[PDB]
Design a protein around this ligand. Structure first.
Ligand SMILES: *[C@@H]1O[C@H](CO)[C@@H](O)[C@H](O)[C@H]1NC(C)=O
Lengths: 230, 169
């Protein structure tokens, strides 16, 4: 039912300006906070900013100060991110995501991402292993260390090849709807581990952790999973 | 010996809807044709008398009914579906509004859940709208649960102060 459908891809000159869209449906638009995520090629996810559709309130990650503007149209149930003054650094995939609170903490639904390409004392999450390899049936764990206490407010995301991130674990150790028992969450305070129990073929993905303890939200560096079988 | 409805209907100052007053009057005759002809009300719906009263802006007076829905009915003053009493309301822009605005009249704007019938909540805790906690500090997705009615003398009747009295049994 729930569905976040975004605009098409846009190629623009440097120093331009583009407004992309995230058209929602299947749920009451004003109930849930909308968010936006930047992701460059082969690089990690960066929490860009959020917006409350019930009153227009927003919050911007100061790293991207004044480079975008978040707005909503309650009549068309659509959220907008207006990117302004585009340099070469800005070319990346931009995801809109929904805050699932008060039910499923963090970002429980993700848009399909719009690929924008131009041409002419914060929290830090540490994921030591960039790459990591196992085989089908093996157990495996992925770790995160935060600079500060973040209690149990951490989510774990799965990004499969060329796909938008899908939520795996919310609130340190709770699975989203329809997540195999093989993914179990663990940790508290500073150290968090995600354990994939019976590694499957499907599990070839890139796993990020993400703290939602304080804005601006921050992600891990991605731990790439790789499977071999012969 | 008839009921002294003037005690609550003609009180000096009314209460905010979220902190609604519950004055109760017992063992007096509650006649209705007498209360009607006393002053021309705007709403006079009927369905040991508890006469609780408060101030709400006009376009939300409709929420003081059985089985309603909205800011007032959900988070401020909920009537049950089986209500057996009367809802009396009337305009009071001249009394409860001042030039430049009267802000003494408040209302609850968010709540983690709905009210049961005749429940009263007067907490002052920072409402958490997002997945992130508020920790008492107010900011984005961290809103103070109570807001103030404007009530300038220029507002339309929809946004104008209305005195409301509910006779319950
Ligand atoms: C309130 O006072 C007015 C006059 O000031 C009077 O007409 C009215 O009857 C009073 N209300 C009640 C319920 O006695």
């Amino acid at each position: 039912e729930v569905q976040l459908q975004q605009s098409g891809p846009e190629l623009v000159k440097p120093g331009a300006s583009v407004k992309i869209s995230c058209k929602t449906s299947g749920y009451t638009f004003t109930e849930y906070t909308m968010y936006w995520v930047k992701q460059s090629h082969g690089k990690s996810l960066e929490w860009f900013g959020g917006i409350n559709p019930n009153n227009g309130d927003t919050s911007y990650n100061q790293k991207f100060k004044g480079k975008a503007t978040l707005t909503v149209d309650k009549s068309s149930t659509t959220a907008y991110m207006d990117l302004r003054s585009l340099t070469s650094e800005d070319s990346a995939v931009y995801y809109c995501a929904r805050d699932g609170y008060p039910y499923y903490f963090a970002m429980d639904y993700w848009g399909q991402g719009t690929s924008v390409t131009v041409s002419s004392s914060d929290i830090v999450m540490t994921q030591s292993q960039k790459f990591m390899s196992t085989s089908v049936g093996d157990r495996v764990s992925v770790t995160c260390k935060a600079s500060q206490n973040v209690d149990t407010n951490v989510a774990w995301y799965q990004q499969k090849p060329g796909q938008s991130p899908k939520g795996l674990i919310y609130s340190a150790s709770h699975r989203y709807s329809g997540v195999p028992d093989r993914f179990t969450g663990s940790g508290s305070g500073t150290d968090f581990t995600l354990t994939i129990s019976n590694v499957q073929s499907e599990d070839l993905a890139d796993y990020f952790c993400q703290q939602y303890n304080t804005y601006p939200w921050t992600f891990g560096g991605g731990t790439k999973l790789e499977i071999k079988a012969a | 010996n008839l009921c002294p409805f003037g005690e609550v209907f003609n009180a000096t100052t009314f209460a905010s809807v979220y902190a609604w007053n519950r004055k109760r009057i017992s063992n007096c005759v509650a006649d209705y044709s007498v209360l009607y002809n006393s002053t021309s009300f705007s709403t006079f719906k009927c369905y040991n008398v508890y006469a609780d009263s408060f101030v709400v802006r006009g376009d939300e007076v409709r929420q003081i009914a059985p089985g309603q829905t909205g800011r007032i009915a959900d988070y401020n003053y909920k009537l049950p579906d089986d209500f057996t009493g009367c809802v009396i309301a009337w305009n009071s822009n001249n009394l409860d509004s001042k030039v430049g605005g009267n802000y003494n009249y408040l209302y609850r704007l968010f709540r983690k859940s709905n009210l049961k019938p005749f429940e009263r909540d007067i907490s002052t805790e920072i409402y958490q709208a997002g997945s992130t906690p508020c920790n008492g500090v107010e900011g984005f997705n961290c809103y103070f649960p109570l807001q103030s009615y404007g009530f300038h003398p220029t507002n339309g009747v929809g946004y104008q102060p209305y005195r409301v009295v509910v006779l319950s049994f």
